Design a binder for this molecule. Structure first.
Ligand SMILES: CC(C)(COP(=O)(O)OP(=O)(O)OC[C@H]1O[C@@H](n2cnc3c(N)ncnc32)[C@H](O)[C@@H]1OP(=O)(O)O)[C@@H](O)C(=O)NCCC(=O)NCCS
Lengths: 252, 253, 255
């Protein structure tokens, strides 16, 4: 029973679709609570190996909500902090983005590991116009993704960036025609969910390390996890499969 | 009144123009000082919401006065803290725009990278040719260029002295936008006007949030952004921008 | 020295390391690791070298770490050996290094090209990190250096699906310095290394070190580091001659 999102299970893949189409999938408290509860639930399920978050063909998400007062009221509630539950998900996540990914919507797309964007996708941080700052990690994930000159530009002017520019700048994984987004997301998700669940979780964690410490510490952390792969059924099977020219049979 | 620069005020936008055309706006101690003095004064002016730095159509700034460095000892360099004054530019809280035409080489490329937004004419040529004269970047290029375009390309430019055109700079992350050379200055005004018409406060907080992404872990940067986000619901200006949007009218910050 | 898995040539101020395991697509075993590091290290120590190129064949730069070596590794073997640690000797090399990448550079092959300073690629180049699906994850720095080079969404894409990236995407994403036609790769790399090896030795070493800094600390720190390094340059003879020469409209004669 979710009011603003739909949740579907398809083999080892779970899909969260933002289901508030009238508001152009605007993000609010409730959306935040539901999206985060469903992903956490899918993370805990051993029969799931990839999570998709998507919106409509018109809008991944058009922004935050505007009706949604003190500083203490914001400090005490930790307004937006719950979004952090999306980043704490261990199972790989995939943002399938069509049309408007603006404000929070752009920031949600950025919280996922992999970002497959439609033909029609448009990204932006236009809340400077309302005299509002990003509160979902936009000034943080945007800059690390596309670099300073473009990050500043988008954040201070509110201009949009289309799919092609997001692809050449480092914002997206790959671009696909709009009609094919959901099938390309699912096929991508499917491929990842068929990997060893341990290896996929390890690989994702090692990559995330790239923004949390110096290169020397990241290199060390990666090398250590890599040695740990060797204590697993799946490293042995995966490599045995290569040498015996056969499909690998993972029990994750 | 300045010797190597011109300064112009038009509405809420400031424009610093390098004025050594004979020398292609090559940077020297005097230029460094003036730009910093002008930048700082525009930043302190409450009727200023954005600053432009530009040169001429031929060169933003191509190289530096090498005579001022030829006979420097380590001791003179360390004592003068040679180049440190340029840090005053990065410490400016108001958004800065580099409008780069033609050559932005050595110091000039480093000067462009210090600004927040980088608007390039299709004529812009970027490069760090220092290596040739037996030195390395001295004004943050090894740090800013690498962060903008990645190790592979930054190693290439700094170790060979090769130039990179406006288009390669756009795809690799160095510039915000490329515009035709003839539109360069007008386009910088347009972008500066837009920025200068934002809440001065919000625009400064946003710039400060962005700059944090180069100074700590994502984890830390996220927390800093959230705290500062909450602080902008305090402030009058967020009521006006909000009412403006509901009433489909322009905000009067 | 005398090597099994690599070839080593020196010409004027440029040394070239060519990977030589063609029966296994230059797959990287411990033998290759040790030989590449020892060669690079001893070239770095030679005063008559100014640049080092690492390359493979037209068909594969390297198609990974050697899987047969890894298949029969136990956790104890890997932890005891600190498996892969030794590649760090290459990153410690002071002379500028150039990766010249034709064909496959996947897994440790991609990782190896990423350890170099400059990456010149053939139009024919194919990058990837398909370790996932062997039941592992990059063990030679790919999750770190790839992400940093090309950004999260693309590094996550490659590392979790193990898809390949062609030279043109690599070039536009920040992974390589330049692409050239495959036939010109070796000619080009060699021209690049000539230019670098003719520069001042100290300047090129300082500059390489300063760039590397930019991944190791915050920006404030790197900036202070670069500037201090810049000031030391004023004690170098090559600064003097490099600047003297420029002023006199002549070519520098580095002693
Ligand atoms: C690159 C590749 C696609 C092209 O292969 P190909 O053209 O079909 O050629 P082959 O597989 O015959 O080519 C190579 C052979 O060289 C060996 N080889 C290739 N890559 C190897 C590797 N990484 N480790 C050990 N041997 C390797 C093969 O085992 C085979 O040897 P064999 O003849 O003695 O059995 C393929 O060899 C491959 O993908 N290998 C593994 C890549 C990988 O997963 N890398 C890193 C993640 S852990």
């Amino acid at each position: 029973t979710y009011e603003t999102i739909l949740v579907e299970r398809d083999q080892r893949v779970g899909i969260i679709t933002l289901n508030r189409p009238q508001a152009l999938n605007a993000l609010n408290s409730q959306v935040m609570n539901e999206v985060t509860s469903a992903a956490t639930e899918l993370d805990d399920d051993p029969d799931i190996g990839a999570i998709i978050i998507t919106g409509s063909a018109k809008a991944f998400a058009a922004g935050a909500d505007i009706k949604e007062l003190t500083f203490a009221d914001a400090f005490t509630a930790d307004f937006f902090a719950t979004w952090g539950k999306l980043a704490a998900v261990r199972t790989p996540t995939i943002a399938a983005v069509a049309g408007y990914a603006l404000g929070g919507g752009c920031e949600l797309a950025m919280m996922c590991d992999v970002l497959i964007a439609a033909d029609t996708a448009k990204f932006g941080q236009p809340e400077i116009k309302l005299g509002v700052l990003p509160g979902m990690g936009g000034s943080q994930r945007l800059t690390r993704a596309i670099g300073k000159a473009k990050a500043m530009d988008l954040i201070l002017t509110g201009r949009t960036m289309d799919a092609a520019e997001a692809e050449r700048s480092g914002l997206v994984s790959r671009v696909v025609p709009a009609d094919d987004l959901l099938t390309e997301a699912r096929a991508t998700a499917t491929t990842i969910s068929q990997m060893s669940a341990s290896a996929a979780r390890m690989a994702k964690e090692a990559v995330n390390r790239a923004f949390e410490s110096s290169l020397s510490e990241g290199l060390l952390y990666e090398r250590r996890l890599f040695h740990s792969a060797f204590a697993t059924e799946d490293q042995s099977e995966g490599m045995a499969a290569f040498i015996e020219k056969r499909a690998p049979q993972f029990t994750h």
